[PDB]
Symmetry: C2
Subunit: 185 residues, 2 copies
Amino acid sequence: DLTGKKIAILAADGVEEIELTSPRAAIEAAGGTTELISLEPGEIQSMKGDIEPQEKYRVDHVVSEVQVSDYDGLLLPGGTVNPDKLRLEEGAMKFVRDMYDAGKPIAAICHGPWSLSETGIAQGLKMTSWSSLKRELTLAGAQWVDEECVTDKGVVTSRKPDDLPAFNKKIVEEFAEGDHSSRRK
Amino acid sequence: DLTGKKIAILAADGVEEIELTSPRAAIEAAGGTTELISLEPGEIQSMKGDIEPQEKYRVDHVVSEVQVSDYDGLLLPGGTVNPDKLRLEEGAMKFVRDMYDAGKPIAAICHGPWSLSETGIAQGLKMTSWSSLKRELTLAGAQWVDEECVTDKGVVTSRKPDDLPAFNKKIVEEFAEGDHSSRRK
Ligand SMILES: [Mg+2]
């Protein structure tokens, strides 16, 4: 049950459509709400298979316009271009790090984990991702595994759209359990 | 100064258009020729700014069909999705590794240097790239700097489309010289 819980979805242009819409649908189905947070105001271009433009999604706030205390969790959807744009923006990376340091549950799927590497979160973390992130994540000090869904220290990761059924269940469990500060000391 | 020199261009779907077409035109203007090498037959999808689909370009050869001795050099264009796709294919990474190990000049622009990380070439290399690759290239053991065009061990790197004029000028003088297996020992 996510009644009264609000989840931040951090995403730029290039986000994999299904990796935004399907977990968002799980969060609302569990009774929670989500808000789409981004670099610039307006809309964000979603993709299918990284390069086929699909629908556009309205951004609720720019990253500098929100605080960590407004949210009970963080979702980092993939699509190759999206996290690659996010990792270059200081306010974006500060928000991801701050979310973590405040004990808030974090879910990243597919290319999404790139933000966990940029912020240093990956270091000593058990996690998965899309196969192309294996190198950077292992170099970054991660305990990288190839599994459909991995949870460590309130951080949920998955590899791909087909992991969504298992990811959606796990993200809801973790968003519901709440503050993981004590597991991150 | 490239008459009789043939340059292999390795690119997948998601290739930044100008990073394919501009260096190719500079090679052809120099008297040289190029061939587009890829993962699958037919065409690849080029993009503008990573996410706006532009023109499709015809593939000449699949990567698991061509020989190193066939070429005098290697171009690795960027666009985010393309090297991310390229780096998961063993055939494609073995081909960029054999080109290096035989001493042939290599040029990589923007996200293109990802293949140089996957393949171990980035270790001990002075190089640049699009800014988002800084973290991985650093952890891979590269000497990463923020510069217009870097050449080391006959590997030419540049950051972005703005760097095209300098990149293009450098690659023509590097493809002209050839055989750097003495510098990579
Ligand atoms: Mg937990």
